């Protein structure tokens, strides 16, 4: 198996005023995005040590008792407002990852979109405070962090493409984001229950099938464990892991608005027993942000594709990646 060309950028010139450095910055975007699809994104300013030692605290200490009182619908049929926030359960012998996902902090009971009880909006599920003390404040707390890198990664891939770097930024604010964070578990067990790996055509063991991803652009911390690979015409290519760096690509929102100039890259999780983490941040604008659909290959820049309300293709997405690859 080959190995992926994944370049370290380092993005600190896209919180900066130097323009041309910007630019710079932008050109190996866009080489990257053109490429394989995936880029590290270094020097970005996240405490990540802080960030892994959190979550692996909180995944090692929560109960199965705060897990059924946290439980998303698909685990809990008493909690039916809960489709995206909440726990996402392993089950023992058959089901091997588990996760926790939480959604922008400033959709409480009094936003005009819970009020309005307009889908995909919710309002997070915490665990006790006495029980995993200062947990929330770091999680809330990490998604501004995040989202401030992603912010400025948007402003790249902007520039990128041609474009004010607000053309996308504009989008992405802290009052309506539909953005999450996923604290993703892989165990390691013995032994490891043979439900939970899927074999690929290619005779690849598999812990996630192959798939784009439901977002504008993603942004990735994972574990130095090897895991992920990326689809070429040539087969599957191992990307190396790096666990200073955020690994960055983009969903299927992206390949939509350009015309899949940028590509939502294809790729599939490797099993491996041991013990891991995954942390994605989903980068989603507003339920109805709509960007105009573009073709930086035109000179007009003019396209054929209809444009499509973010909120919508949030809804449709996340039903149809379940459907696909199975309730995680
Ligand atoms: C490859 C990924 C980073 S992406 C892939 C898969 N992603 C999802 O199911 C999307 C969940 C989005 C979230 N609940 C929401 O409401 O927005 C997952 O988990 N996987 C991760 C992994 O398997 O490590
Ligand atoms: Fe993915």
Known sequence: VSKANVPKI????????????????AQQIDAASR???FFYAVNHGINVQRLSQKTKEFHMSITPEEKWD?????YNKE??????????LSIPGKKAVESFCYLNPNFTPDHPRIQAKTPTHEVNVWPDETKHPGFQDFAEQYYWDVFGLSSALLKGYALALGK??????????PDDTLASVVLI???????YPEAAIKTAADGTKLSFEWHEDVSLITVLYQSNVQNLQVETAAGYQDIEADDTGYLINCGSYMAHLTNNYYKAPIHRVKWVNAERQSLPFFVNLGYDSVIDPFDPREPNGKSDREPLSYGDYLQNGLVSLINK???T
């Open 164 to 173: 004010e770097e607000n053309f996308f930024a504009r989008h992405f604010k």
């Open 325 to 327: 690859n199975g309730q």
């Open 10 to 25: 380092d993005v600190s010139p896209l919180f900066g005023d130097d323009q041309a450095a910007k630019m710079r910055v």
């Open 79 to 88: 909690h039916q407002d809960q489709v995206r926030a909440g726990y996402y």
């Open 35 to 37: 490429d394989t699809g």
């Open 185 to 191: 578990r892989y165990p390691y067990l013995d032994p």
């Open 70 to 74: 946290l439980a998303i619908r698909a």
